[PDB]
Design a binder for this molecule. Structure first.
Ligand SMILES: NCCCC[C@H](N[C@@H](CCc1ccccc1)C(=O)O)C(=O)N1CCC[C@H]1C(=O)O
Ligand SMILES: *[C@@H]1O[C@H](CO)[C@@H](O[C@@H]2O[C@H](CO)[C@@H](O)[C@H](O)[C@H]2NC(C)=O)[C@H](O)[C@H]1NC(C)=O
Ligand SMILES: *[C@@H]1O[C@H](CO)[C@@H](O)[C@H](O)[C@H]1NC(C)=O
Ligand SMILES: *[C@@H]1O[C@H](CO)[C@@H](O)[C@H](O)[C@H]1NC(C)=O
Ligand SMILES: [Cl-]
Ligand SMILES: [Zn+2]
Length: 612
């Protein structure tokens, strides 16, 4: 690289191990800005030129990272861990770990290539109809909408199978190779496999257990939401397609991965004939740009005594699927350019409630950025990945309240009663409860792939073991070890850790409680709305401004009063419907779980030649 980016020498002393770092930070944000802006061009525009570029920028970083990497350890290793200012012993500790950059040049290029590609294969795939080579559907929007609102078994089946073959099969060979490399890289940095490296980020020698336990506490919650919906579904598709004693077919839950069922609310809503808790409809009625959405999400944040979106963001941002036709990574994501000036969001936005919360979710990342920019490089990265995924969801909780919505125009009217209360709680259950199993499962599968528990020889066989086992869902068509359904999930191909969405979902309520308390709210945790609460917001920002400077376990105590993750405040949120569902299944003689595992639905009638 430039040499004015290379280390320099420093002292084997602390007062000079600190001098090692003030430097790295000034240089690092040049090298980081580059690699980041490069990607921003590849994702905003997926072209061979941009990809080759991106792969280049990565190569620079990879060895900017090696230079200071091997240097930081050259002389700061056998004494670190005894550094008075550990808010620093942990920056040096972040630098001493390179990862891939401990990979010979050839392998690094292989590495970066795989990445570029997988994301391309994943984001480029499509589903085409049989006889008519007529317009081929894409995951967003076509496929998504078909799942979100089509009630044709066969049709959903065509898209579920279409997408899973189309995205997975080609992806498999690359994945196996990316894993071998990723491993090799961190086997250097001390860990055993990338798995261990990924879960060393919560600093809890007890992490996995704490999670397994925390799940048991919630499993009952899921199992009941499950049997309840499974039966509402039986009601609509019949006895041939649904088994009241078996796992649910993975394509009927209204979402490609069956990770959230809030899109079938109209089929399970307990007390219908009441005001609809779905302004998935009056957002359209009104006159709503995709921008209008990033504007309302904004306005909550302001009110919350927190900074608004910078002007750079408002323009260095992609909030709609472009018109120049430029194949893009439509996923929603938030970008931190490490230059304290450029922060943007990338997402192919269009007008659904479901996505109006995703917008908040994303703003949560941006707001976290804006808040901790004023610290070093090797800690921007918050308490733990969990806290990051939480920030926007918390504020989302308050927004979802029917009552919060009326205050802002999408819930015309009012009934502050039980029935409506149950409906609301069920809707939220479809979104947060139904996810818990999945969120847990994914990295469950991966830590095992990274560890060799699950060789490519059992990629799909161990994936459906986990899916059936936790979600109680089964594949609508047969599968084998030419398939790679794990790869059809945006996060597997783009190598993003998942166990943080679990942590996130459990700990977004701890926040919601803690915040509602300081807001001075009293009434029911699930009707609280920390709106316009400068008092609450100040409590949140203190955690934000903290980044990775001290331990999450401490930043958490200060904010919530607890040394760790707790499902208690979550149980307390859903309490009503928790008891309600439980009572309804029993009376209706339901069976919690799937004892008839191994059961699979039959294909439609002559598949595949239908309405599609
Ligand atoms: N309707 C699509 C929304 C996508 C939003 C969100 N995006 C992701 C982006 C992840 C990412 C990590 C590293 C590099 C590039 C991207 C996010 O964490 O915000 C997400 O994945 N989410 C949000 C909730 C659950 C999880 C998902 O759907 O699997
Ligand atoms: C796993 O299942 C797939 C089918 O979903 C099997 O593959 C074939 O499927 C294609 C259509 O996608 C048919 O044209 C082929 O005729 C099917 N092959 C056979 C042998 O019936 C696939 O073979 C199964 N894979 C393994 C490894 O057993
Ligand atoms: C580098 O990090 C320091 C904090 O030590 C910060 O003040 C600065 O803005 C960052 N970059 C530059 C060029 O100072
Ligand atoms: C990724 O795909 C490209 C073609 O775009 C190919 O040249 C390259 O070999 C693939 N990368 C790897 C690591 O296989
Ligand atoms: Cl994680
Ligand atoms: Zn996120």
């Amino acid at each position: 690289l430039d040499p004015g980016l290379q280390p320099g020498n420093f002292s084997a002393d602390e007062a000079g191990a600190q001098l090692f770092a003030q430097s790295y930070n000034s240089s690092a944000e040049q090298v980081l800005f580059q690699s980041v802006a490069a990607s921003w061009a590849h994702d905003t525009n997926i072209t061979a030129e941009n990809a080759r570029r991106q792969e280049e920028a990565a190569l620079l970083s990879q060895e900017f990272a090696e230079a200071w990497g091997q240097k930081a350890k050259e002389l700061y290793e056998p004494i670190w861990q005894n550094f008075t200012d550990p808010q620093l012993r942990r920056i040096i500790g972040a630098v001493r770990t390179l990862g891939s950059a401990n990979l010979p040049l050839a392998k690094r290029q292989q590495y970066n290539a795989l990445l570029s590609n997988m994301s391309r294969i994943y984001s480029t795939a499509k589903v085409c109809l049989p006889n008519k080579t007529a317009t081929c559907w894409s995951l967003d929007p076509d496929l998504t909408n078909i799942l979100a609102s089509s009630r044709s078994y066969a049709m959903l089946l065509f898209a579920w199978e279409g997408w899973h073959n189309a995205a997975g099969i080609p992806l498999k060979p690359l994945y196996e190779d990316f894993t071998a490399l990723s491993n090799e890289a961190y086997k250097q940095d001390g860990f055993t496999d990338t798995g261990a490296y990924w879960r060393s980020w919560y600093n809890s020698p007890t992490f996995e257990d704490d999670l397994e336990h925390l799940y048991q506490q919630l499993e009952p919650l899921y199992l009941n939401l499950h049997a309840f919906v499974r039966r509402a579904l039986h009601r609509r598709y019949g006895d041939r397609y649904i088994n009241l004693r078996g796992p649910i077919p993975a394509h009927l839950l209204g979402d490609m991965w069956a990770q959230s069922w809030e899109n079938i609310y109209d089929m399970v809503v307990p007390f219908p004939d009441k005001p609809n808790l779905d302004v998935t409809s009056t957002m359209l009625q009104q006159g709503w740009n995709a921008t209008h959405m990033f504007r309302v999400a904004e306005e909550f944040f302001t009110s919350l005594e927190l900074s608004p979106m910078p002007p750079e963001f408002w323009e260095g941002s992609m909030l709609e699927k472009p018109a120049d036709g430029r194949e893009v990574v439509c996923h929603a994501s938030a970008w931190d350019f490490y230059n304290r000036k450029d922060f943007r969001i990338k997402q192919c936005t269009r007008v659904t409630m479901d996505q109006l919360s995703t917008v908040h979710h994303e703003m949560g990342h941006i707001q976290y950025y804006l808040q901790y920019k004023d610290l070093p490089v090797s800690l921007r990265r918050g308490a733990n990945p969990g806290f990051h995924e939480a920030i926007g969801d918390v504020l989302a909780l308050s927004v979802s309240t029917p009552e919060h919505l009326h205050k802002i125009g999408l819930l015309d009217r009012v009934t502050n009663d039980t029935e409506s209360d149950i409906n609301y709680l069920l809707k939220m259950a479809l979104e947060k409860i139904a996810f818990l199993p999945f969120g847990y499962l994914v990295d469950q599968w991966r830590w095992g792939v990274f560890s060799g528990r699950t060789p490519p020889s059992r990629y799909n066989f161990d994936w459906w073991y986990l899916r059936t086992k936790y979600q109680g869902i089964c594949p609508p068509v047969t599968r084998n070890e030419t398939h790679f359904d794990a790869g059809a999930k945006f996060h597997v191909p783009n190598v993003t850790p998942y166990i943080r969405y679990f942590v996130s979902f459990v700990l977004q309520f701890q926040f919601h409680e803690a915040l509602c308390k300081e807001a001075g709210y009293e009434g029911p945790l699930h009707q609280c709305d920390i709106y316009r609460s400068t008092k609450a917001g100040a409590k949140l920002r203190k955690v934000l401004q903290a980044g990775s400077s001290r331990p999450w376990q401490e930043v958490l105590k200060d904010m919530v009063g607890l040394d760790a993750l707790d499902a208690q405040p979550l149980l307390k949120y859903f309490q009503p419907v928790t008891q309600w569902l439980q009572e309804q299944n029993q009376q209706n003689g339901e069976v919690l779980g799937w004892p008839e595992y191994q059961w699979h639905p039959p294909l439609p009638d002559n598949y595949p030649e239908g309405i599609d």
